[model samples]
Target: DFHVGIVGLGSMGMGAARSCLRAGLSTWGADLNPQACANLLAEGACGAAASAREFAGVVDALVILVVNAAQVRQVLFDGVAHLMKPGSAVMVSSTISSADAQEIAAALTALNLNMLDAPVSGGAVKAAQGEMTVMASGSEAAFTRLKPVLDAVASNVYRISDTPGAGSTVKIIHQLLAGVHIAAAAEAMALAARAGIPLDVMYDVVTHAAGNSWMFENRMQHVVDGDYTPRSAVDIFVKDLGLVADTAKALRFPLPLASTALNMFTSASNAGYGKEDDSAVIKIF
Candidate 1:
């Protein structure tokens, strides 16, 4: 039986751990928060190391569920590189740039370790339901090794390409759509508010119209309910949209809409609503 190790036991990570356990995999989970660790332990997950460095050599596959490229680099190269077995694969599930993914893959290849650039979508709710979408890429051997684990956690898995960076590229594209849609939704609601239109009526009309989107429908509720509690926070998009913007700059591709949306999200973060729900981006206006 192959043992699975997961780092970053936040909403998404904890949910993935539950799915892995339900699939009967030997699972170990780690997080900086004791509360998160305790909750996982209560649900019968194997207690993980306080430091990711300690989980090396003990698992057949390691999942990196941290926030971004920096954390990924720290956990893999700085922390666990020397401790992992040669054949063990590392699946990176964070939102990061394609360039970073390629760089990390090359480093792992040099060490004779397999690398999967697998970034996931769907919010914490879908993750807990084992229904997230994964954009993944890697060598055939790496994919074969990870298919079962991917199946255990995701409802949809797109094998974007054989190369590592392609997965992150696809994920960046997804984030572009997500960020733009959310920003557009916020702008529309702001316009309605300025016009003194009843917010609920505007929501209903827009939701039924051609201008509607998944983000629009879902986040509009937050505006109506005045609940800024995070399902995903404003700063998350600040990072995600920043990744998209950076990738576009590298390709010399001008993405005005995405750049605008990026600024809106980052502006929300700067306005001290970084920790609020992504829907709070509308509050900036």
Candidate 2:
């Protein structure tokens, strides 16, 4: 049996941990929230710990699914890295910048640990179904060693490179499209609301027409339902689009649409809708 450890038991991480459990991996979960760890243990995880340091040496793959690059760094270097078994893979599935990935990779290498920049997509729904997509880059050895954990959590694991940064590159670009699409979906629905057309009719028409997007179909339904409970919160795009802006600034690339989307997310956040569903971006209109 392969041993795997997941840090971060939030929605995406929780779903991914469940998938690993379903696949019969020797799953270990860690989170600051004691309830999260307890819940995973109740679901039959091999073990649950307060910190990755507790099982870092035993797990073949230590998967980091925390919110950002800073948290990832803190989790690894603060107290866990020294305890990790030499040659074990550190699989990072957080959406982080390419530079951050590279830096972490070099640090892990110095410690004789394999580093995989393996950011994932398909959201919590697909994560729960064990069908998330992973855009991954790392050494061949790391890839080979992480196969069982990858198989348990991702249905499509694209090998983006044999070094770090490339996977994060691809993921940031994906976030660009995702954030912009959610913003565009909100704009289109806003127009429908002002036109006196039934919101449901407009939704039906758009979903069946050339104007449809995956975001429109999925996020706009939340708009139609008048529910703002967050599946993906507006603050997520605020941070993600902020990453897009920072990345583009480093390259001196212009992202007009992405910039506009970022503004909308920030505005929504400023309006206190940050924790609501991303569909709540429509509220700003």
Candidate 3:
């Protein structure tokens, strides 16, 4: 069995590492946060120091689960790229811009390394259950190499293209829809609250109506429960919506709904709910 290495042990990364372990893979995990490393260590995973350089040559596949493009660059270019074996596959699982994905893939190819633009969804709950949906693209060889690992962690794996970044393109499109839906849900709920319509009633009606979206039903629960815990913080939207804005800007495509949603997420972050779940965007009203 080839050793599998996972970087970043945040909610999603932690769940992914656990899934890999459960699949009986020899798993190693690394994170800047000691607690995260310790958690995985307790679950039968070897914990590496924060430096990716130390374990780079030892693993067969490296799964990058960091937050954004910057972190991904730091892990690969500044930290681990030189240390990896020449043909080892690097799976980038961050939700980032397609341009960044292309740049990283080009760099990896130059070094004769395999790169996969594999962004995942289904949130922490689903990730923990080993049911994430991975939107991935890469060469046939890359897919063949990663199939077992993907099967272990994802319920649905969409192979979008044979080039790196195609997976990110799809995930970005999905985020555009997600950001817009969340903002729209916030607006509707806020208006209903202001109109003295019971929140529960509005929730029930909308959920059963054609107007409902996945974001609406899931995020609205936070408003109903009055719990603003950080399952998927508002800052996440700030980053995701920023990606949407950048993509739209690049293509000169105007997305009114996405723009409106970006503003709502910005407002929520500015209002100090950035650390709270995206559902807290409703509090801006």
The backbone clash count of each candidate, in order, is 0, 0, 0
lDDT (CA) for every model shown? 0.87, 0.92, 0.87
Q: Model 3, range 9-47, lDDT digits (tens) per residue? A: 888888888999999887888888888887787888865
In model 3, what is the error at residue 160, expressed in angstroms? 1.0
Clashing residue pairs found in predicted model 2? none
Q: Quote model 2's TM-score.
A: 0.95
Tell me the RMSD of model 2 versus the true structure.
1.5
C-alpha displacement of 221 in model 2, angstroms? 2.0
| Segments in model 1 whose C-alpha atoms lie over 4 Å from true places | none
lDDT of 2 by residue, 172-261 (tens): 999999999999989988987898888999999999999898888999899899999988889999999999999999999999999999
Q: Candidate 3: global Cα-lDDT?
A: 0.87
Query: Model 3: clashing residue pairs?
Result: none
- Residue by residue across 1-285, what tens digits does model 1's lDDT show? 867888988888988888888888888887888888787778776666576666677787888898889999988774786688887888999998888999999998888888999999887788888887999999987787776678788999999999899999999999999999999999999999999999999999989999999899989889988898887889988998888888888889999899999999988988999999999999889
Each model's TM-score, in the order given?
A: 0.93, 0.95, 0.93
Error of 2 at 32 (Å): 2.9
Residue 30 error, candidate 3, Å? 1.2
Better of 2 and 3 by TM-score: 2
